[PDB]
Amino acid sequence: DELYRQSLEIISRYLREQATGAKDTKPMGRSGATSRKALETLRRVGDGVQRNHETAFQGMLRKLDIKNEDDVKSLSRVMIHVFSDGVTNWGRIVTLISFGAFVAKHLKTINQESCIEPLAESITDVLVRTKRDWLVKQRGWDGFVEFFHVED
Ligand SMILES: Cc1cc(C(=O)NS(=O)(=O)c2ccc(N[C@H](CCN(C)C)CSc3ccccc3)c([N+](=O)[O-])c2)ccc1-c1cccc2c(CCCOc3cccc4ccccc34)c(C(=O)O)nn12
Numbered sequence: 001d002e003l004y005r006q007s008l009e010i011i012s013r014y015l016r017e018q019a020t021g022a023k024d025t026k027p028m029g030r031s032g033a034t035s036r037k038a039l040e041t042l043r044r045v046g047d048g049v050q051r052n053h054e055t056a057f058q059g060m061l062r063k064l065d066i067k068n069e070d071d072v073k074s075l076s077r078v079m080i081h082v083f084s085d086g087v088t089n090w091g092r093i094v095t096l097i098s099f100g101a102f103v104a105k106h107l108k109t110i111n112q113e114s115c116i117e118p119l120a121e122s123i124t125d126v127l128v129r130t131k132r133d134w135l136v137k138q139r140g141w142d143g144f145v146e147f148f149h150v151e152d
Helices: 002-020 032-052 054-064 069-073 075-083 090-109 113-137 140-148
Strands: none
Touching (some): 002 032, 002 113, 002 140, 032 054, 032 140, 069 075, 069 113, 075 090, 075 113, 090 140
């Protein structure tokens, strides 16, 4: 189940880096080459999504009323209902993960830093349960990186 493992690594790191403002120094794993480039991709593409859907992200966050790990537990059920509706593409997977980072910054501001792990697990779980095969078809994270690769 390398896919759940790679995905969690990428998503947790992006969420953590986003909440704290600080890159993590610790080495990756099996395909940390891909993992790093996928993290670098999220930095550019994930950040843009946050800038452009700031209002909807704030509105979604406020309506969700997230205060603790408990409020986080219930998040995942709303997450899957919204996400598994409509069409699959890389853009919606990035919207998913980007709102995850938006929620993670909010958690940090409210002193719920440790809600960031289960949030990441919950995002990773939703994505992999509903999109595993599409992800496989796309060459998972290498495909992610290749599809979004632009000149710096
Ligand atoms: C992008 C987007 C666009 C719209 C939208 O509807 N935008 S809108 O129509 O342009 C518009 C509408 C209204 C207003 N304003 C209202 C005023 C209304 N009055 C007329 C009454 C108030 S403000 C307000 C109030 C409410 C909403 C918007 C704004 C305005 N506005 O004012 O600008 C513009 C709505 C939502 C999203 C959105 C948010 C977050 C995640 C997500 C996903 C990923 C899956 C879910 O992930 C998770 C789900 C749940 C939890 C998770 C946790 C972690 C990770 C992922 C999680 C997808 C997706 O995959 O599709 N979409 N999202």
